[PDB]
Amino acid sequence: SQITGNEIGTHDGYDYEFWKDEGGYGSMTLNSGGTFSAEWTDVHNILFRKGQKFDTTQTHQQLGNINIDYGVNYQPNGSSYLAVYGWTTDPLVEFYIVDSWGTWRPPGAESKGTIHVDGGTYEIYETTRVQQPSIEGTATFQQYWSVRTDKRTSGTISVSEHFHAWEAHGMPMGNMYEVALTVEGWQSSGSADVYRNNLTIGGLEH
């Protein structure tokens, strides 16, 4: 139990964040590179993540091919997501590429289509967030989703391929603000040991 309250910073080359709203408790331990362990108990909403933040001057095409090689001993007890999460600006977009989840597969919307990638099948969704918190304050923005049809807890997530498919399905993306492997908990308890999380751009460390 190293971090037990809202905190944002950098650790061993990765931008990390612990975030929760009121209720229950959570613990995050930062390990080498993109790795970390997380534990949560009776929370309303909690997010643990490690990844990379950007200056917001480049589209994902300008950055290059973004990949995350990961592995998580994922043990949620209730609702939870294992996903690559992040944001773009201009337009402001919050996004999730979900590989596993707890008791509920997100996001409750009508699928806009599929994406075959990294040996799996993902369904694409888009939802609107009205006057909700964001990296730019209270705002109304779109939330994009790629959600695997079956659960997976290791492998490579070809992030750029999801981004290209969202744009091809008419869901535009702004300049990149953040991309990070994330474990989210909702009205639940759980544990997740992210023992591998290697984020590369064009094959190189950011």
Positions marked active-site: 94, 184
**Which among 46, 52, 61 has a CA at the least distance from the CA of 192?**
46
DSSP string, 17-34: EEEE-SSSEEEEEE-STT
Q: Is 97 left (phi over 0), alpha (psi -120 to 50) or beta?
A: beta
Rounded Cα distance between 153 and 146, Å, is 15
Are 39 and 1 contacting, i.e. CB atoms less than 8 angstroms apart? yes
